């Protein structure tokens, strides 16, 4: 269609499937080896890029040019590495991938949304949308395409330490939240084939329904462990919201370190290939985990041959290597020489990869949009994730007796009030793991409103407010407070290192509960990614709000504790009245919870 030098491929107004299979015929195995290979950041080079062909890159929890970086170096580092691609003989340009799981989370000054298990909670799912349309255009603000997420296991056993990134273990809530999906990508078309990759374009991004599959039902929830359920569990409780996912265009699966029932799923392709791509129809690409490949043995990269062949030939399309890419590169390219993986396999690879990039623009718009830079923590953007953080929380108490007058709402007007606790000013442990590093962090680390500065942005100007972390009861008895709102609760953790099977907060936060709620009637706000014990918190206390991990935006605990909207969260998990009883399910046998799924107390607006 039309100039001498003219490439069906570079062509704009030509059908992706036509884009696809003439730039497939033209690639040697190297290009499509490249293709297939994801690299982090840490370990690219312009030269790397190139001389390799590669596929795509990533940035692993944490992993950033700089701490503080703004939107524009990230731009800057993302467009270096697509020149660098770009100048390959074919020009196809790299996929950057990143964690983009509550908001845009690995960046200085990105809004930070509640964790998943909270949004579970607000069982809105058009909220969910809009927080997936918001994300997008924070991960654009930074010039990346591709977020992994969302993340739709359904959490059997909250012992697991990636519990809070599930939206319930309800697999109908967990359903009703692919919304994120068209959110992230754009809505799909109304002729839509379900299994069809679909991304609008230049301001939306790429998703990644993930763990593929039953990452949510290990045993004791151990993780990168063993899911043991039949067929008809793994089919009724952890694949169905691969589904609707397929019917929203999700553009990639990324597959879990799990194993079901002794088979690894780096390894299975009855499930990857038989079942995501023959059953489903999937068409996109399939992603491995973290060195997920290497895990298919014992030890890990025991046999890198092996774990090559192994998720090749199970159905994977793209490997996170992330780092040793010659080694993977070299192995692929032998087993392709030697016969035992066919060309067929690869070129189904590199179809789908291709295919999911001609679809979401990337040959038309390979570069940042300097432009989109000012959409990072955009007030509008933080005004979402505080109505989401409101409606994520869940009242638990609301007076000791049932003759007391509700302590809840507070009033903004009082002489002196009381806020306590290690999680009231301390903005690291609103938002938890996946925040700015991998498992989060303490303190100050990014643009935020504390629960502490929440209050004093909300009360009257003649409130004086007083903060105390840990004070004892006699500092309680002699303030002269009208009220206290105490936070305590988890630190950030991703069970990488996090842990604590026990399920009980640190300390000191129940002493500290203790002493407060013993001198002055008190709201306590339980920050945690999941259930934890909680009846010696509850017997203190005149209230409680379990507010799970509700990221950067702090005023959204403060407007339902002060009345500005009314408590509607409810729970999206069991609350168990002991680890002892775990696992224990909506449904089983044993079924004797503390508070049962659905459960909250609300309030009205004053
Ligand atoms: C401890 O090593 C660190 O692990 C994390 C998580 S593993 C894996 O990472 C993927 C890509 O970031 C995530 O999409 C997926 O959900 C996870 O299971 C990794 O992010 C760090 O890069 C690595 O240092
Ligand atoms: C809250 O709203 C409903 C009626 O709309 C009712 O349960 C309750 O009496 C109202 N007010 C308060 C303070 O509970």
Same mark, same amino acid.
């Given at each position: 269609?039309?100039?001498?030098?003219?490439?069906?491929?570079?062509? +704009?107004?030509?059908?992706?499937?036509?884009?696809?299979?003439?730039?497939?015929?033209?690639?040697?195995?190297?290009?499509?080896?490249?293709?297939?290979? !994801?690299?982090?950041?840490?370990?690219?080079?312009?030269?790397?890029?190139?001389?390799?062909?590669?596929?795509?890159?990533?940035?692993?929890?944490?992993?950033?040019?700089?701490?503080?970086?703004?939107?524009?170096?990230?731009?800057?580092?993302?467009?270096?590495?697509?020149?660098?691609?770009? #100048?390959?003989?074919?020009?196809?340009?790299?996929? %950057?991938?990143? &964690?983009?799981?509550?908001?845009?989370?690995?960046?200085?000054?990105?809004?930070?949304?509640?964790?998943?298990?909270?949004?579970?909670?607000?069982?809105?799912?058009?909220?969910?949308?809009?927080?997936?349309?918001?994300?997008?255009?924070?991960?654009?603000?930074?010039?990346? =395409?591709?977020?992994? +997420?969302?993340?739709?296991?359904?959490?059997?056993?909250?012992?697991?330490?990636?519990? %809070?990134?599930?939206?319930?273990?309800?697999?109908?809530?967990?359903?009703?939240?692919?919304?994120?999906?068209?959110?992230?990508?754009?809505?799909?078309?109304?002729?839509?084939?379900?299994?069809?990759?679909?991304?609008?374009?230049?301001?939306?991004?790429?998703?990644?329904?993930?763990?593929?599959?039953?990452?949510?039902?290990?045993?004791?929830?151990?993780?990168?462990?063993?899911? *043991?359920?039949? $067929?008809?569990?793994?089919?009724?409780?952890?694949?169905?919201?691969?589904?609707?996912?397929?019917?929203?265009?999700?553009?990639?699966?990324?597959?879990?370190?799990?194993?079901?029932?002794?088979?690894?799923?780096?390894?299975? =392709?009855?499930?990857?290939?038989?079942?995501?791509?023959?059953?489903?129809?999937?068409?996109?690409?399939?992603?491995? &985990?973290?060195?997920?490949?290497?895990?298919?043995?014992?030890?890990? /990269?025991?046999?890198?041959?092996?774990?090559?062949?192994?998720?090749?030939?199970?159905?994977? &399309?793209?490997?996170?290597?992330?780092?040793?890419?010659?080694?993977?590169?070299?192995?692929?390219?032998?087993?392709?020489?030697?016969?035992?993986?066919?060309?067929?396999?690869?070129?189904?690879?590199?179809?789908? *990869?291709?295919?999911?990039?001609?679809?979401?623009?990337?040959?038309?718009?390979?570069?940042?949009?300097?432009?989109?830079?000012? =959409?990072?923590?955009?007030?509008?953007?933080?005004?979402?994730?505080?109505?989401?953080?409101?409606? @994520?929380?869940?009242?638990?108490?609301?007076?000791?007796?049932?003759?007391?007058?509700?302590?809840?709402?507070?009033?903004?007007?009082?002489?002196?009030?009381?806020?306590?606790?290690?999680?009231?000013?301390?903005?690291?442990?609103?938002?938890? /793991?996946?925040?700015?590093?991998? !498992?989060?962090?303490?303190? $100050?680390?990014?643009?935020?409103?504390?629960?502490?500065?929440?209050?004093?942005?909300?009360?009257?100007?003649?409130?004086?407010?007083?903060?105390?972390?840990?004070?004892?009861?006699?500092?309680?008895? #002699?303030?002269?407070?009208? %009220?206290?709102?105490?936070?305590?609760?988890?630190?950030?953790?991703?069970?990488?290192?996090?842990?604590?099977?026990?399920?009980?907060?640190?300390?000191?936060?129940? @002493?500290?509960?203790?002493?407060?709620?013993?001198?002055? $009637?008190?709201?306590?706000?339980?920050?945690?990614?999941?259930?934890?014990?909680?009846?010696?918190?509850?017997?203190?206390?005149?209230?409680?709000?379990?507010?799970?991990?509700?990221?950067?935006?702090?005023?959204?605990?403060?407007?339902?504790?002060? /009345?500005?909207?009314?408590?509607?969260?409810?729970?999206?998990?069991?609350?168990?009245?002991?680890?002892? !009883?775990?696992?224990?399910?909506?449904?089983? +046998?044993?079924?004797?919870?503390?508070?049962?799924?659905?459960?909250?107390?609300?309030?009205?607006?004053?």
């Amino acid at each position: 269609h039309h100039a001498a030098d003219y490439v069906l491929y570079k062509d +704009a107004t030509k059908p992706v499937e036509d884009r696809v299979a003439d730039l497939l015929g033209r690639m040697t195995l190297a290009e499509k080896i490249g293709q297939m290979t !994801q690299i982090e950041r840490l370990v690219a080079t312009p030269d790397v890029l190139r001389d390799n062909f590669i596929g795509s890159l990533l940035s692993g929890g944490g992993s950033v040019p700089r701490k503080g970086a703004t939107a524009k170096e990230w731009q800057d580092m993302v467009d270096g590495f697509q020149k660098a691609c770009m #100048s390959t003989r074919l020009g196809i340009p790299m996929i %950057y991938g990143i &964690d983009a799981v509550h908001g845009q989370n690995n960046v200085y000054g990105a809004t930070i949304f509640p964790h998943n298990v909270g949004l579970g909670a607000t069982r809105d799912p058009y909220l969910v949308k809009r927080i997936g349309e918001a994300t997008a255009l924070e991960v654009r603000a930074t010039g990346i =395409q591709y977020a992994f +997420a969302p993340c739709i296991a359904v959490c059997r056993d909250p012992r697991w330490g990636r519990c %809070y990134e599930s939206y319930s273990e309800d697999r109908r809530i967990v359903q009703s939240m692919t919304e994120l999906i068209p959110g992230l990508q754009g809505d799909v078309p109304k002729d839509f084939t379900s299994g069809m990759p679909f991304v609008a374009g230049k301001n939306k991004v790429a998703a990644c329904a993930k763990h593929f599959v039953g990452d949510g039902g290990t045993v004791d929830g151990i993780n990168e462990n063993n899911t *043991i359920i039949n $067929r008809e569990g793994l089919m009724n409780i952890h694949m169905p919201a691969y589904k609707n996912a397929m019917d929203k265009g999700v553009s990639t699966v990324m597959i879990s370190y799990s194993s079901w029932n002794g088979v690894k799923m780096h390894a299975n =392709q009855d499930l990857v290939t038989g079942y995501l791509k023959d059953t489903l129809k999937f068409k996109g690409f399939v992603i491995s &985990d973290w060195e997920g490949i290497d895990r298919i043995t014992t030890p890990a /990269g025991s046999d890198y041959s092996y774990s090559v062949k192994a998720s090749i030939l199970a159905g994977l &399309d793209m490997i996170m290597v992330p780092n040793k890419y010659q080694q993977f590169i070299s192995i692929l390219t032998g087993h392709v020489n030697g016969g035992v993986i066919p060309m067929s396999r690869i070129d189904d690879a590199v179809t789908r *990869i291709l295919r999911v990039k001609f679809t979401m623009g990337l040959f038309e718009n390979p570069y940042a949009d300097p432009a989109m830079a000012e =959409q990072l923590g955009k007030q509008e953007h933080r005004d979402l994730a505080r109505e989401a953080a409101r409606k @994520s929380l869940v009242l638990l108490k609301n007076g000791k007796t049932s003759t007391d007058a509700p302590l809840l709402p507070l009033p903004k007007k009082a002489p002196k009030i009381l806020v306590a606790g290690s999680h009231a000013d301390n903005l690291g442990y609103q938002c938890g /793991g996946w925040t700015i590093e991998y !498992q989060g962090d303490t303190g $100050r680390t990014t643009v935020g409103t504390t629960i502490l500065e929440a209050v004093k942005a909300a009360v009257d100007p003649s409130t004086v407010v007083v903060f105390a972390e840990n004070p004892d009861a006699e500092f309680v008895k #002699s303030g002269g407070f009208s %009220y206290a709102i105490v936070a305590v609760g988890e630190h950030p953790y991703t069970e990488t290192k996090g842990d604590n099977l026990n399920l009980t907060i640190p300390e000191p936060g129940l @002493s500290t509960v203790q002493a407060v709620c013993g001198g002055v $009637r008190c709201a306590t706000v339980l920050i945690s990614g999941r259930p934890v014990v909680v009846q010696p918190l509850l017997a203190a206390s005149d209230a409680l709000v379990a507010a799970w991990l509700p990221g950067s935006e702090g005023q959204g605990v403060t407007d339902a504790l002060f /009345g500005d909207f009314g408590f509607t969260g409810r729970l999206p998990r069991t609350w168990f009245k002991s680890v002892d !009883q775990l696992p224990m399910n909506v449904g089983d +046998a044993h079924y004797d919870p503390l508070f049962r799924l659905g459960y909250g107390l609300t309030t009205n607006a004053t």
